[PDB]
Amino acid sequence: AKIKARDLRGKKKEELLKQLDDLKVELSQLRVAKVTGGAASKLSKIRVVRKSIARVLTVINQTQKENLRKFYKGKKYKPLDLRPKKTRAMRRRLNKHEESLKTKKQQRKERLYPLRKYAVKA
């Protein structure tokens, strides 16, 4: 049957492995049938099983990851896989808050002398 990704996500983790190895098993005689000179219809099916194995193994790799990052969601330290990987130069920059830090000398300046809104005539 046409294996889809939508129905594979709700199944049990061990149920996916029960489906995964059978796809691995069923692909085994398909490579045998190529060497022995099988029908051309069965030779077109082996790409479907390769993509179906990729679909099953993706969900296993997918569904494991949001379980891990939900487990590490509240903790202080998280693995580097769950950390945001975006263009090392800006991972070395400051946070959202740290360049918003003004000194006590500087904060006195805008309170005492704020920038004014004004206009002049002709």
Partner 1 sequence: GAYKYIQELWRKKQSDVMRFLLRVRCWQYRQLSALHRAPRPTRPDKARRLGYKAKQGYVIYRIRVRRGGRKRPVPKGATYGKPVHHGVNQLKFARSLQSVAEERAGRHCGALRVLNSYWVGEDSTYKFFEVILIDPFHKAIRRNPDTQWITKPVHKHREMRGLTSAGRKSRGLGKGHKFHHTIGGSRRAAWRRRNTLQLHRYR
Partner 2 sequence: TKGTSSFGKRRNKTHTLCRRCGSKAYHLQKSTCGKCGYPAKRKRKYNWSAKAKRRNTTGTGRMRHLKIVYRRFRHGFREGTTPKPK
Partner 3 sequence: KIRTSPTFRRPKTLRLRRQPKYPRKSAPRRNKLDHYAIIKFPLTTESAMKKIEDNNTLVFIVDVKANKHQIKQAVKKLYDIDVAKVNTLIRPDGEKKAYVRLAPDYDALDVANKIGII
Partner RNA sequence: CGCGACCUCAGAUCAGACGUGGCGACCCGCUGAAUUUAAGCAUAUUAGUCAGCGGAGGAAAAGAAACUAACCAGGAUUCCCUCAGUAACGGCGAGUGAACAGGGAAGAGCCCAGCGCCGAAUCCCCGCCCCGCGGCGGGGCGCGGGAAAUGUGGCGUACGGA
Q: Buried (b) or exposed (e) across 17-55, using 16+ Cβ within 10 A?
A: eeebeebeeebeeeeeeeeeeeeeeeeeeeeeeeebbee
Applying CB under 8 A, does 11 fall inside the site for partner 3?
no
Which of 89, 115, 120, 122 binds RNA (CB under 7 A)? It is: 89
98 binds, among partner 2, partner 1, partner 3, none (CB under 5 to 8 A by kind): partner 1
CB of 1 to partner 2, least distance (A): 21
Applying CB under 8 A, does 76 fall inside the site for partner 1?
no
CB of 102 to partner 2, least distance (A): 27
User: Which three-class secondary structure state does DSSP give residue 51?
Assistant: helix
Which of the stretches 1-9, 43-51, 57-65, 90-98 binds partner 1 when contact is defined by CB under 8 A? Answer: 90-98
Q: Which residues contact 85 (CB under 8 A, 6 or more apart)?
A: 91
Applying CB under 8 A, does 31 fall inside the site for partner 3?
yes
Question: Among candidates 109, 11, 95, which has minimal Cα distance to 59?
Answer: 11
Applying CB under 8 A, does 106 fall inside the site for partner 1?
yes
User: Can you tell me the distance from the alpha carbon of 40 to that of 26, in angstroms, rounded to the nearest whole number?
Assistant: 17
56, 20 contact by CB (below 8 A): yes
Q: Residues interacting with RNA, by CB under 7 A? A: 69, 73-77, 82-85, 89-98, 103-106, 108
Using CB under 8 A as the criterion, which residues of the chain lie in contact with partner 2 when the complex forms? 84-87, 90
